Design a protein around this ligand. Structure first.
Ligand SMILES: CN(CCCC1CCCCC1)C(=O)[C@H](CCC(=O)O)NC(=O)N(CC(=O)O)Cc1ccc(OP(=O)(O)O)cc1
Length: 102
């Protein structure tokens, strides 16, 4: 749905995400530019060394089966992946909050 930005670049996704109006955990999903066949979760975060920043998480997919950031926490679809990380961070920088406007 709405959060799937497709073939958007890393840099453009960082420019969209970095808007100060975006709360922590504003996100998108896109393709990986560098890993082909893979996806990325791009997430806004904040620390006080750097302020506003973005984290990117590689999404992989085992061949005949699950989508994953870490290999024991798998999901059958990208939908399930994102719906999970919106309930809990589970190791992520932040829980997923806002879909990115863009
Ligand atoms: C899968 N994990 C490892 C950690 C996963 C956690 C999840 C919670 C539970 C415990 C394990 C990653 O993905 C990490 C996540 C953030 C981080 O740990 O810092 N990110 C990463 O390794 N990056 C590469 C780098 O630093 O070289 C950043 C990056 C840059 C461009 C990009 O985009 P693209 O794919 O289009 O090139 C995609 C990624």
């Amino acid at each position: 749905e709405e959060w799937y930005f497709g073939k958007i670049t890393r840099r453009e996704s960082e420019r969209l995400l970095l808007n100060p109006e975006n709360p922590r955990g504003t996100f998108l999903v896109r393709e990986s530019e560098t890993t082909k066949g893979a996806y990325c979760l791009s997430v806004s975060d904040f620390d006080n060394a750097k302020g506003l920043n973005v984290k990117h998480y590689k999404i992989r997919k085992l061949d005949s089966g699950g989508f994953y950031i870490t290999s024991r926490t798998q999901f059958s679809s990208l939908q399930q992946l994102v719906a999970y990380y919106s309930k809990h961070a589970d190791g992520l920088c932040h829980r997923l909050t806002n879909v990115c406007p863009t």
